[PDB]
Amino acid sequence: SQEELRQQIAELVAQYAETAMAPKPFEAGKSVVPPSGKVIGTKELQLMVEASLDGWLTTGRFNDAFEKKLGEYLGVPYVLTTTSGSSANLLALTALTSPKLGVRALKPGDEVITVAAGFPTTVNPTIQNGLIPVFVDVDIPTYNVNASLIEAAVSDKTKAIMIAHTLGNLFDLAEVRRVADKYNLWLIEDCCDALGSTYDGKMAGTFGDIGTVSFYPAKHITMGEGGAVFTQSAELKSIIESFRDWGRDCQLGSLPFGYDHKYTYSHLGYNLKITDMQAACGLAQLERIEEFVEKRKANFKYLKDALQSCADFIELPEATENSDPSWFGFPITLKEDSGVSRIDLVKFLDEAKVGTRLLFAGNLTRQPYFHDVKYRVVGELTNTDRIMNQTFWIGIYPGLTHDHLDYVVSKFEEFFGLNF
């Protein structure tokens, strides 16, 4: 009678969701236009109940299904789930320190090339593994690494490049891969805000050795808290897994014969696994990713077209050459000769119920926790500093309707006095 009880519960929740998770009609001056948010329906809540009923708890039925369907969407054979994007970035960079990679293994002291205009945990794992971060400037209005500056940052200590596809926009993969392959550097693609982004027709994350993604509520799809590491190399997939799972194996050491393999450890590991409840949510969301990716590209096009009327005061976002960005948010840099400060605009928008966000750390090297970190900067961080000082982004996620954006646009116009 269980199979029944399930399907009956599946109904009771489906009708609970249609009432709860229902889109509220937009209302200027009352409704908010957040920079991001999750979009969950019946399928999400249903599967989470299914997982709750299973009583299994740790990863299993749903986690297998999720890692599989996500591997399909991405076009990669190996996908490992983890606690968050940050955790995924950590596993990705840590995995390359495995002595199983012989001479290719990252060692304390080695250098990782990246940029300072990003999210802290894109860089932290490098520091947390005793490596030295080496920064170069980014470009505006793509808000991604200025590829041309990469080559000069390469020294004999350089072992890898780890940068994110900022806000869904892709970086110059053509130039990055060129510099990577030339010097035999590892490459890690932080796609935490770029699920669905393509470059030269190929899905983001599948160009380098390892790719990461996040399932925090603000990203493309969510599990509440969750993330994933994916690769095409079986060797890396096994190393990542070991690090995630207490560092356990699957010879060295002097353990007695017959010692349980389960309790044999080959790596300096962590326990960064998730539950099947989180997996379920993720699984339902995967049924909406294609839609989500399309609505983001649309909202971006619409919004930008409309906002072109303020081009004298703000610089609008531009997708990177030869790429089709699955926009995470809408970045805007306010001109210095506009007569007002970012604070003014943000505060104005805030009062208008229009949410905004700065570009994460702005300039990592100027963040307080970077006070005593050992790092190198090649060239100047002019654009990064400009980002920290003048840049901010707004919302184009699936939860925003054309009426939402129209409102945001009129506010920008009202602000700059363009409605007169």
Ligand X SMILES: *Cc1c(COP(=O)(O)O)cnc(C)c1O
Q: Which of 6, 61, 177, 376 binds a copy of itself (CB under 8 A)?
A: 6
The verdict on 339 binding a copy of itself (CB under 8 A) reads no
Instruction: State in Å, rounded, how far the first CA of the chain is from the last one.
Output: 68
Cβ-based nearer residue to a copy of itself, 150 or 381 = 381
The option from ligand X, a copy of itself, none interacting with 164 (CB < 5 to 8 A, set by class) reads: ligand X
Which helix (H) or strand (E) segment holds residue 282: the answer is helix 276-285
Q: Examine residue 100 and tell whether it contacts a copy of itself (CB under 8 A).
A: no
State in angstroms the smallest separation of the CB of 177 from a copy of itself: 28
Q: Which two tokens stand for residue 330?
A: 């809408």
Chain residue whose CB lies nearest ligand X: 85
Among 31, 232, 338, 389, binds a copy of itself (CB under 8 A): 389
Q: Which two tokens stand for residue 138?
A: 């980014």
**In the complex, least distance from residue 212 CB atom to ligand X, rounded to whole angstroms:** 7
- C-alpha separations of 346 from 116, 140, 327, 352, 356 in Å: 23, 20, 21, 10, 7
Cβ pair 242, 261 in contact under 8 A: no
User: Which CB, 158 or 285, lies closer to a copy of itself?
Assistant: 285
Pair 357, 256: CB distance under 8 Å: no
Quick one: which of 156, 260, 337, 351 contacts a copy of itself (CB under 8 A)? 260
Binding residues: 85-86, 119, 193, 214, 246
Binding-site residues for pyridoxal 5'-phosphate sit at 85-86, 119, 193, 214, 246
- What is the rounded distance in angstroms from the CA atom of residue 135 to the CA atom of residue 151? 12
Q: Which is nearer to a copy of itself, 156 or 251 (CB)?
A: 251
If binding is defined by CB under 8 A, does position 273 make contact with a copy of itself?
A: yes
For a copy of itself, which stretch binds (CB under 8 A), given 181-189, 297-305, 325-333, 355-363? 355-363
- Phi, psi values for residue 200, rounded to 5°: 60, 35
Which of ligand X, a copy of itself, none is residue 284 near (CB under 5 to 8 Å by kind)?
A: none
Residues that bind ligand X (CB under 6 A): 84-86, 89, 118-119, 121-122, 164, 190, 192-193, 214, 216, 227, 271
Q: In which residue are the tokens 């790719």 written?
A: 211
The entry of a copy of itself, ligand X, none that residue 122 binds, CB within 5 to 8 Å by partner kind: ligand X
CA dist list (Å): 280 to 61, 65, 80, 277, 285: 9, 9, 15, 5, 9
Residue 167, classified by CB atoms within 10 Å of its CB into exposed (0-12), middle (13-18) or buried (19+), is buried
